[PDB]
Design a protein around this ligand. Structure first.
Ligand code: CL
Ligand code: CL
Ligand code: CL
Ligand code: CL
Ligand code: CL
Ligand code: CL
Ligand code: CL
Ligand code: CL
Ligand code: CL
Ligand code: CL
Ligand code: CL
Ligand code: CL
Ligand code: CL
Ligand code: CL
Ligand code: CL
Ligand code: CL
Ligand code: CL
Ligand code: CL
Ligand code: CL
Ligand code: CL
Ligand code: CL
Ligand code: CL
Ligand code: CL
Ligand code: CL
Ligand code: FE
Ligand code: FE
Ligand code: FE
Ligand code: FE
Ligand code: FE
Ligand code: FE
Ligand code: FE
Ligand code: FE
Ligand code: FE
Ligand code: FE
Ligand code: FE
Ligand code: FE
Ligand code: FE
Ligand code: FE
Ligand code: FE
Ligand code: FE
Ligand code: FE
Ligand code: FE
Ligand code: FE
Ligand code: FE
Ligand code: FE
Ligand code: FE
Ligand code: FE
Ligand code: FE
Ligand code: FE
Ligand code: FE
Ligand code: FE
Ligand code: FE
Ligand code: FE
Ligand code: FE
Ligand code: FE
Ligand code: FE
Ligand code: FE
Ligand code: FE
Ligand code: FE
Ligand code: FE
Ligand code: FE
Ligand code: FE
Ligand code: FE
Ligand code: FE
Ligand code: FE
Ligand code: FE
Ligand code: FE
Ligand code: FE
Ligand code: FE
Ligand code: FE
Ligand code: FE
Ligand code: FE
Ligand code: FE
Ligand code: FE
Ligand code: FE
Ligand code: FE
Ligand code: FE
Ligand code: FE
Ligand code: FE
Ligand code: FE
Ligand code: FE
Ligand code: FE
Ligand code: FE
Ligand code: FE
Ligand code: MG
Ligand code: MG
Ligand code: MG
Ligand code: MG
Ligand code: MG
Ligand code: MG
Lengths: 168, 168, 168, 168, 168, 168
């Protein structure tokens, strides 16, 4: 029952992505409220920041404790440019969440290639959450194409931040 | 009522410290439970990680929204070596918390030098919390000098993780 | 423990400002609802009027009772011109609240220059409230730049008038 | 249904009286507790200050919103001399409240002279309150003629500040 | 983050003052009830004795535990003369409480001179309480100038011994 | 029914002992937690400090009020040396409590020699409490001879600080 080093590597990479994405999202949330005058969009992005810097990373660490895998902490992130407006901020978040889905697929494929069924089981959570988080972000992006009034959008977002049988 | 760039710089530096310290503490918490077989010490360090990556950073961002100061996100951290044992892990945390106190003092001094009384008010929270957090860490360090049995220490720590009128 | 006459003067000046600002705000609230057809903006300005003519002045009087300082009542205010629209009404309120912050800073500086630490303690409330009140006003100003529909703005304001750990 | 300019003038004058009387009463309340060592008399005068700077002025503004009358804000008040003792302080309040009654009578007379029955209806509140407020003040004045002991008077006043079918 | 020896000295001095003042107040409370036949005045002075020998001293000790400062216990007090009457007993208490305020100011000044912002934070409690305790004592002193009947005064004091947003 | 001057003297001496012992115990409690890293032992000694500086002294003062005896306040205490360890700290407390018992016996003997049966009745409380307090202290001393692990002792003490039909 020796741990897979490839899976160990891939999951340390996912830990990093989650840490760094959450830090970018914290800045993006600040910018939503401060510069773009959209506090509820900020609360949405802040809640996603906390999701990435919380359970998304913690489950990897917990799993590692259980199987012998080593946790690595190497984090480098800088927000050097901000999107121009709020539509583009949420569109950037979307693209980053679609990339999460790609990364998770690769891990699942690797687990099966490695006959690591515990790792294939563990990553099902992230397979499901990849679509859940993408859908939540997609719901907000759409509002920017349904209304040209920031305060309507803001009112719709505040009802969003106030489980599906499959997608959680 | 123009914002101080020195104070802006100093507080962006404190944001970074908090982010990075919290990430080191997350790794240290993992190591406490996994390698040093001390789960309750890990819960203590995890709760401190979440304090640093939460309110400690968020208050700076909130303050910036209110005053015009710019938030910067530039984070670089790597855990390249781990302390040898649990005593030394909590002693490293202590040293890092004593350095927090030094950094906070400098900000308070600067605020007064700048006649930025809103910033002197805002940092009182961190002045107080510098001693509070240091004391919490100090209480754990002491246990390692009061007992040579990991499980006694663990039992004492679990009652610690289950407000002072001045120190919060 | 003799009272500072400079601090006495400065705080009698702050009492006057608060009385007079509250009276201007009462008129401005009336104008918001009557002429600009924005009743919820009026309730916001009325609540700020009552804040200025209440606790803001009362705490100064209470403090004076406790320390020997003399209260002076000399009030002169006339609303001779009204802003053209609602955006400009809330922008005028903003400017007047930013000036409050300047005045409070001066008092805090003076207290420290005078070694009047009771007065430096007493004014911390106003240091904090200077930013709190400015932020509340800033939140409303922003709405006028996020929507060109008075009734959307009105709906957003009514959820605002229906404590932060630092800013109160 | 065009608004009466005479009634508009008279009611803007009553608004001013109420604002200014309330400000004098706030100072007088401070003096009662601080200099005359009578805190409960101060609470009585403070409650009358808040009555004058609250409902007494607000109803005029509300009425104006409803009928087209213009609100004017021109306030000038200075407390340049204080009565010598507490008896005389409450006797001054009395005289000022008896003058309120005269002013209200004039408004009622004018409304009838103008065939402004909405204004005659609106001022009935102030006709009634003119006697109510005068009676409350009269009850306190009497105590100063019933006892030569400040603390007896104070004890009687504190039970006063802890509706008649006609007088409200 | 080395502790200030001057601040250590000054706070050991404040500990002593509090211990000794509380012991004088215990005797003074006894004298109020026994010799001056004023039991409620005694309960007031006893509650102040317990305040000085409790939180006032304990917070200093707690603070010392947290920062490395050394507690010293050197106490010398003797009540060799008693004031002649009750008015003078409460007037002596007043003078001793006004001196507390002077001593606390000096500590705050020293903390700022020393750039000891933790100590400046810790002493804010005592800055505030210096005025609070003085005001409580002042309220009783006044009664002796408002009535020449011990039992009226006693009745007023018993309602006093049966938080302000700023002064606690 | 004239009061005994010998009993008056002896009870003024017991008042002094209680005041001074309580002050030594407050320092000893501080040392237990700070230097000896034993917070629960400190809470035990702090509770004994408060017992001595509270009821133990107050009952003497109350008794004096009732019988004509004069209270004297002459207090001199300095903690010039601290015991080396925690065992010795609690052993010093023990010795001081055994001496309390001797002193109380003398008072009881004197009361009977003086035919002061009210004083013999009053001191029964202290006769009983002499053994009660000694037993409480004895229970802690024993722990230091039952375990060589500070944290076991600490855990046992914390269940002690979380009435016998005879001994109270
Ligand atoms: Cl870079
Ligand atoms: Cl935007
Ligand atoms: Cl995409
Ligand atoms: Cl693969
Ligand atoms: Cl590296
Ligand atoms: Cl270990
Ligand atoms: Cl260190
Ligand atoms: Cl500086
Ligand atoms: Cl004018
Ligand atoms: Cl408008
Ligand atoms: Cl402005
Ligand atoms: Cl200045
Ligand atoms: Cl004038
Ligand atoms: Cl008077
Ligand atoms: Cl009259
Ligand atoms: Cl007429
Ligand atoms: Cl002497
Ligand atoms: Cl007397
Ligand atoms: Cl004095
Ligand atoms: Cl100094
Ligand atoms: Cl000595
Ligand atoms: Cl020890
Ligand atoms: Cl012994
Ligand atoms: Cl004998
Ligand atoms: Fe906001
Ligand atoms: Fe969610
Ligand atoms: Fe765009
Ligand atoms: Fe998620
Ligand atoms: Fe809605
Ligand atoms: Fe809803
Ligand atoms: Fe809702
Ligand atoms: Fe809804
Ligand atoms: Fe809704
Ligand atoms: Fe709903
Ligand atoms: Fe576990
Ligand atoms: Fe905590
Ligand atoms: Fe070691
Ligand atoms: Fe903290
Ligand atoms: Fe246990
Ligand atoms: Fe427990
Ligand atoms: Fe438990
Ligand atoms: Fe327990
Ligand atoms: Fe337990
Ligand atoms: Fe418990
Ligand atoms: Fe309306
Ligand atoms: Fe408010
Ligand atoms: Fe405009
Ligand atoms: Fe305010
Ligand atoms: Fe709505
Ligand atoms: Fe709502
Ligand atoms: Fe609602
Ligand atoms: Fe709603
Ligand atoms: Fe709604
Ligand atoms: Fe709501
Ligand atoms: Fe008062
Ligand atoms: Fe009333
Ligand atoms: Fe007179
Ligand atoms: Fe009225
Ligand atoms: Fe009564
Ligand atoms: Fe009653
Ligand atoms: Fe009552
Ligand atoms: Fe009653
Ligand atoms: Fe009563
Ligand atoms: Fe009653
Ligand atoms: Fe009694
Ligand atoms: Fe109190
Ligand atoms: Fe006298
Ligand atoms: Fe106090
Ligand atoms: Fe009564
Ligand atoms: Fe009562
Ligand atoms: Fe009562
Ligand atoms: Fe009562
Ligand atoms: Fe009563
Ligand atoms: Fe009551
Ligand atoms: Fe502790
Ligand atoms: Fe006990
Ligand atoms: Fe030993
Ligand atoms: Fe006892
Ligand atoms: Fe236990
Ligand atoms: Fe238990
Ligand atoms: Fe328990
Ligand atoms: Fe238990
Ligand atoms: Fe237990
Ligand atoms: Fe139990
Ligand atoms: Mg295969
Ligand atoms: Mg300067
Ligand atoms: Mg200076
Ligand atoms: Mg007619
Ligand atoms: Mg300096
Ligand atoms: Mg015999």
């Amino acid at each position: 029952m020796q741990k897979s080093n490839k899976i160990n590597d891939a999951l340390n990479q996912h830990y990093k992505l989650n840490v760094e994405l959450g830090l970018v999202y914290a800045h993006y949330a600040h910018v939503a409220d401060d510069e773009f005058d959209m506090p509820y969009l900020g609360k949405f992005i802040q809640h996603l920041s906390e999701d990435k810097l919380g359970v998304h990373k913690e489950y990897i660490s917990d799993y590692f404790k259980r199987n012998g895998m080593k946790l690595k902490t190497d984090v480098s992130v800088a927000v050097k440019s901000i999107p121009s407006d709020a539509k583009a901020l949420i569109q950037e978040v979307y693209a980053r969440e679609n990339e999460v889905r790609d990364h998770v697929k690769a891990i699942a494929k690797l687990a099966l290639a490695e006959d690591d069924y515990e790792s294939f089981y563990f990553i099902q959570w992230y397979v499901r959450d990849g679509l859940k988080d993408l859908t939540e972000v997609d719901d907000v992006v759409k509002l920017f194409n349904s209304s040209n009034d920031k305060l309507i959008i803001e009112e719709t977002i505040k009802e969003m931040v106030e489980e599906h049988e499959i997608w959680g």
